[PDB]
Amino acid sequence: RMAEQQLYINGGYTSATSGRTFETINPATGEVLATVQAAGREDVDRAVESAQRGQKIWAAMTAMERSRILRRAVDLLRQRNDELARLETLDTGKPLSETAAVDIVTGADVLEYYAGLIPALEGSQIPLRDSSFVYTRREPLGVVAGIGAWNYPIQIALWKSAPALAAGNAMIFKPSEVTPLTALKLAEIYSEAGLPDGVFNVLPGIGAETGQYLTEHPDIAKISFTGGVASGKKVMANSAASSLKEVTMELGGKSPLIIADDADLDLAADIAMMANFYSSGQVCTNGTRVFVPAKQKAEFEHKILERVARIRPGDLFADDTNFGPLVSFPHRDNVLRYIESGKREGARLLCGGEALKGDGFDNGSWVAPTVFTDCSDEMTIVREEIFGPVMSILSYADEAEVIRRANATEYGLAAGVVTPNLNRAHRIIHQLEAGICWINSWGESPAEMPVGGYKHSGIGRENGVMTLQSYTQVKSIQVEMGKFQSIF
Amino acid sequence: MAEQQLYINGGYTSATSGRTFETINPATGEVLATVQAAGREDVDRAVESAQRGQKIWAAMTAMERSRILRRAVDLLRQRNDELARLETLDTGKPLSETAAVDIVTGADVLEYYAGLIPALEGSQIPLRDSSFVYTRREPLGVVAGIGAWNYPIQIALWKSAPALAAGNAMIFKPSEVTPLTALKLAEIYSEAGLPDGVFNVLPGIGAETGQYLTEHPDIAKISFTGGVASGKKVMANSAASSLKEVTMELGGKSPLIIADDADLDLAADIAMMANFYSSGQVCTNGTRVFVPAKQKAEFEHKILERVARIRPGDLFADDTNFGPLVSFPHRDNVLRYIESGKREGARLLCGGEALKGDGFDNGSWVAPTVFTDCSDEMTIVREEIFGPVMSILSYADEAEVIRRANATEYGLAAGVVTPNLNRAHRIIHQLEAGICWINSWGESPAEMPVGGYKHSGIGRENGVMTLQSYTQVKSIQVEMGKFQSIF
């Protein structure tokens, strides 16, 4: 359909020297959207050298000069929101009702946030004594690398590149092989806004190749990766063994949603629905273990059924469509394997449990919105991240128990509680072992709010002031004005 | 000394590994102690102990924690000389150093963080009238510190102080070369009122105890100080096992840049202190000394004159300022580097051999060694030696010396000597190192974050930021409006 997609290095498109290509498909039709060139080792070397030269120019500008350029990129993203959203829908299978409202909106929200913070990035000064003081500089890391995931392709590209660029770095970005297209458009926009050549380069490729070449490269100072829990362990280990790179990891979760016995069950069901079936369940922070008091569980199940009836699959460009196919057919096969395991392990199928078939579904990787109830803590669907539309409903009896069971996992990304009670809301949330916690809501991730995982769900944070700072490195400088004394 | 047990849950307890090792007095070769090594089940015991202790510790008020760490400071000051003598026996470093630096600056950092506990704060962010966010700086839980042998109790204090002050429990593994003072520190913490399990000490071997710590599923963070190669393996194993947070303080090949307007007596004094303290066994040492071509001859004479002042001898004598290296294997390695310097064409200015004779034949002594006429591709210029070996390099201009200073995978420290305002700041701002000294070397105040660029480290120690990096951020959104679902 579209032309063979080249690499983006040094302010324009350039052919890869790898001689290798891959295809990206439209998950709703199975059609090939584009043939895409894959960056090889020499391509990564070209991108790093380009990034080194560009970073020097970028860092030598004033803080406000950098701010204005990133703000111009925000302006262009707002103007092109709908066009970029359509492309993202084609590449991901997510409904346009989502991509036009969330993906570029919130990606640009973070770029806009960091653009305004650049002049506020400051070091410290510490007096030691009348004759000596220390000051610190927050220096750029230099060239850093971002490795994106396929569920929010351009949003992730913006959330990694915005603080990296605002901190004075160049970033080489590798999009998921599943969804390479919008990251290339972002690089065009950055260049149009005045970003120096080489400061944002985009290298499509395969993880086993391009991703590894980046984590091994000797001149890249930091790796930021978003993806699966197991993949993150390998990326971090490779980043360390090659050259001791700094690392950020934003990985998966099995986040608990705790419904208190004083919660309004319409509200609780609304939150559970949004925590499970947005982006067809392909969200790392989803509240996929839903804990409900035994005395409310039957009514809660009814309310879930009543809202599952409001899920509308269909034309991804239609206004009322709010549910899409999964990103790929192998992913659907994995999600169906998890569903079959829930049935086989004795969970009660409340709804769904099968692929969608028939007119307008036979060419996409559709899975019906699936709810299991009567679940138990040892079940595979309860223990493991599924990354599809599968909610697990778990009965509980008391507050201490549900806190224990919520925390009894190696994941630790998000969590939430539904309660009108002041004390319950704060005291329960304070005990949960997760980095992202919602009270009487789910999913909102303001640019101001640092987000990331506890335990196996992540390293470091994205968003907030702290992430601008973590794309710098601290240099301490002591000025000694007294006469230095040697003991020799 | 008696057979040294593990320290778990507020007292000594026998290891179950079936393994012991010996620590040697580097000045005499005598065995100081047989020490038990913590095995896999022992690490498990320590983590379970730490988990229960951490809960009690974190439930106290901020000032209750502050007072306990301050009482530990008071005990460290009272016992400074006794602890220094033990550290001298275990490390070979002169008592003139250990009694003035190791416990003084270790306790300085504990005292610093004890006062900061009440200031550890989260944030609050208004989103709209109906919703706001607040953050909590929560303990990581159980963390592990793995120390190096050159500053054993100082490193134990620099890792445990912010870790404990942030509300964590720490399991600490000292170097097998120097296990003894970390056990004394654990006794002192308990005597000060630290809850049982909050500071456990597990002597052992790196490939066993250290590996088990990096692999354990319930340890949230590893902080390691040691060699560049070892740090890469610790970080990679910490990642592969359970995605632990990491801090790495590794080695360096730090450049000292002498400007052509520097007073050469000052430059030589700084070079001496940057190369021969602790017999050169210091990660931040300024072991590439760049001197302008026109000053190089006189600088070499000034170094020779000060090298002659070095006093090797009885480690407990007041005038001794130079000790043996920590171990006979380490001496063998340092001598191999010195031989490569000779083989590769560097001009030996002084030293270059083991010390022999009265008072030296039973210790791992190496003479203070200076090479000059060095070039950038020599092995002694490229690689950290961790012994008393200075490399003097001629340079011609400022742009050149900055490139050559930065042309290394290391990135720990650097310094410049110049009375000129513009030179001092402009050069330092261009160096790729985390710790930079102007007209001085070595001072590491508790307030000052320290760590490496590039292969020399991950994260930082000391300063306010290290208290914060021993917490993890939890973000909490309070939604007071009516949640909207699209389903």
Interface of A with B in 416-455 (CB under 8 A): 425, 429-430, 434-442, 444, 446, 448-452, 454-455
Contacts of B270 in chain A (CB under 8 A): 484, 486
d(CA B367, CA B351): 5
d(CA A366, CA A358): 11
| Residue B138 amino acid letter | E
> What are the angstrom distances between the C-alpha of B443 and each of A173, B47, B368, B413?
40, 35, 22, 11
Interface of B with A in 157-186 (CB under 8 A): none
Strand partners, A86: none
Which of A94, A98, A160, A297 is catalytic? The answer is A160
Nearest by CB to A449, from B276, B448, B475: name it: B475
Strands ordered across the beta sheet of A7-8: A13-14, A7-8, A200-202, A170-174, A143-147, A222-226, A246-250, A458-459
Q: Which two tokens stand for residue B455?
A: 């292969």
Identify the three-state secondary structure at position B465: helix
Residue contact A425–B478, C-beta within 8 A? yes
Q: Is residue A423 classed exposed, middle or buried when 0-12, 13-18 and 19+ CB atoms within 10 A define those classes?
A: exposed
Element (H, E) at B354: none
Give the count of beta carbons closer than 10 Å to the beta carbon of residue A12.
12
CB B204 within 8 A of CB B173: yes
- Three-state SS string over B233-270 comes to HHHHHHHHHHCCEEEEECCCCCEEEECCCCCHHHHHHH
Does the annotation list A174 as a binding residue?
yes
Does the annotation list B283 as a binding residue?
yes
Which of A209, A246, A250, A301 is catalytic? The answer is A250
Residue contact A240–B243, C-beta within 8 A? no
As for chain B, the residues directly before each break of C–N over 2.5 Å are none
Identify the three-state secondary structure at position A48: helix
d(CA B74, CA B395): 49
Give the residue on B whose Cα is nearest the Cα of A427: B476
Q: Which two tokens stand for residue A369?
A: 């919105």
Element (H, E) at B157: helix B152-165
Nearest by CB to A484, from B240, B269, B463: name it: B269
Give the residue on B whose Cα is nearest the Cα of A143: B454
Identify the three-state secondary structure at position B142: strand
Contacts of B485 in chain A (CB under 8 A): 270-271, 273-274, 307
Identify the three-state secondary structure at position B74: helix
Rg, C-alpha atoms of chain B: 24
Task: Return the closest-CA partner of residue B355 out of B364, B346, B345, B343.
Answer: B364
Element (H, E) at B374: none
Element (H, E) at A106: helix A104-117
B441 Cβ neighbours under 8 A, 6+ residues apart: A484, B256, B270, B273, B274, B286, B415
Q: What is the DSSP string of B261-298?
A: TS-HHHHHHHHHHHHHGGGG--TT---EEEEEGGGHHH
Does the annotation list A458 as a binding residue?
yes
Q: Is residue A369 classed exposed, middle or buried when 0-12, 13-18 and 19+ CB atoms within 10 A define those classes?
A: buried
Q: What is the DSSP string of A355-419?
A: B--STTTTTS--B--EEEES--TTSHHHHS---SSEEEEEEE--HHHHHHHHH-SS--SEEEEE-
Please report the number of interchain residue pairs, chain A to chain B, with beta-carbon separation below 8 angstroms.
212
Does the annotation list B431 as a binding residue?
no
d(CA A25, CA A476): 50
Identify the three-state secondary structure at position B438: strand
Identify the three-state secondary structure at position A136: strand
Contacts of B484 in chain A (CB under 8 A): 270
Widest CA span of chain A, in angstroms? 88
Interface of B with A in 238-277 (CB under 8 A): 239-240, 242-243, 245-246, 248, 250, 266, 269-270, 272-273, 276-277
Angle, alpha carbons B438-B380-B419 (nearest 5°): 15
Residue contact A241–B250, C-beta within 8 A? no
Answer whether B458 touches A (CB < 8 Å): yes
CB B399 within 8 A of CB B62: no
Strands ordered across the beta sheet of B245-249: B12-13, B6-7, B199-201, B169-173, B142-146, B221-225, B245-249, B457-458
Element (H, E) at B414: strand B413-417
Residue contact B447–A126, C-beta within 8 A? yes
d(CA A264, CA B430): 60
Q: Tokens 């052919």 map to which residue?
A: A15
Contacts of A136 in chain B (CB under 8 A): 448-449
d(CA A206, CA A174): 9
Task: Return the closest-CA partner of residue B405 out of B279, B265, B291, B239.
Answer: B291
d(CA A175, CA A39): 11
Residue contact A480–B438, C-beta within 8 A? yes
| Residue B101 amino acid letter | V
**Active site (annotated) includes residue B159:** yes
Q: Is residue A125 classed exposed, middle or buried when 0-12, 13-18 and 19+ CB atoms within 10 A define those classes?
A: exposed
Does the annotation list B44 as a binding residue?
no
d(CA A343, CA A109): 42
Beta strands (DSSP E) in B90-218 are 124-128, 131-139, 142-146, 169-173, 199-201
Residue contact A311–B487, C-beta within 8 A? yes
Contacts of A249 in chain B (CB under 8 A): 243
| Residue A107 amino acid letter | G
Identify the three-state secondary structure at position B128: strand
Q: Which of B309, B462, B476 best tests the A interface by mutation, with the highest count of A CBs <10 A?
A: B476
**Active site (annotated) includes residue B461:** yes
Residue contact A488–B449, C-beta within 8 A? no
Residue contact A128–B445, C-beta within 8 A? yes
Smallest CA–CA separation between B367 and chain A, in Å? Answer: 14
Strands B245-249, B457-458: pairing is: antiparallel
**Active site (annotated) includes residue B187:** no
Rg, C-alpha atoms of chain A: 24
Nearest by CB to B449, from A136, A438, A446: name it: A136
d(CA B321, CA B15): 38
- Name the packing angle between helices A153-166 and A63-79 (round to 10°): 160
Angle, alpha carbons A287-A292-A294 (nearest 5°): 160
Answer whether B390 touches A (CB < 8 Å): no
CB A132 within 8 A of CB A485: no
Residue contact A449–B125, C-beta within 8 A? yes
Residue contact A410–B242, C-beta within 8 A? yes
d(CA B186, CA B198): 9
Q: Which of B138, B249, B416, B477 best tests the A interface by mutation, with the highest count of A CBs <10 A?
A: B477
Angle, alpha carbons A288-A290-A293 (nearest 5°): 170
Strand partners, A137: A475
d(CA A202, CA A214): 12
Element (H, E) at B340: helix B328-343
Contacts of B409 in chain A (CB under 8 A): 218, 243
Which of B87, B93, B111, B159 is catalytic? The answer is B159
Q: Which of B410, B462, B486 best tests the A interface by mutation, with the highest count of A CBs <10 A?
A: B486
Strand partners, A24: A34
Q: What is the DSSP letter of B36?
A: E
CA torsion B259→B260→B266→B272, rounded to 10°?
A: 60
Residue contact A486–B272, C-beta within 8 A? yes
**Active site (annotated) includes residue A160:** yes
d(CA B87, CA B102): 8
For residue B329, the number of C-alpha atoms closer than 13 Å in the C-beta half-sphere is 2
A347 phi and psi angles, rounded to 5 deg: -65, 150
Q: Is residue B331 classed exposed, middle or buried when 0-12, 13-18 and 19+ CB atoms within 10 A define those classes?
A: buried
For this PDB entry, the determination method is: X-ray
Domains of chain A: 7-252+448-476 (3.40.605.10), 256-439 (3.40.309.10)
CB A128 within 8 A of CB A15: no
Identify the three-state secondary structure at position B337: helix
d(CA A253, CA A412): 6
d(CA A183, CA A153): 7
Strands B6-7, A472-480: pairing is: unpaired
Element (H, E) at B180: helix B180-191
Q: Which of A476, A480, A483, A485 best tests the B interface by mutation, with the highest count of B CBs <10 A?
A: A476
Answer whether B406 touches A (CB < 8 Å): no
d(CA A374, CA A353): 15
Q: Which two tokens stand for residue B289?
A: 């000394």
Element (H, E) at A289: strand A289-293
d(CA A394, CA A161): 39
Strand partners, B134: B124, B476
Strand partners, A74: none
Q: Is A291 left (phi over 0), alpha (psi -120 to 50) or beta?
A: beta
CB A289 within 8 A of CB A301: no
Strands A472-480, A132-140: pairing is: antiparallel
As for chain A, the residues directly before each break of C–N over 2.5 Å are none
Residue contact B133–A455, C-beta within 8 A? no
Nearest by CB to B478, from A128, A439, A485: name it: A439
Identify the three-state secondary structure at position B26: coil
Give the count of beta carbons closer than 10 Å to the beta carbon of residue B419.
12
Strands B389-395, B369-372: pairing is: parallel
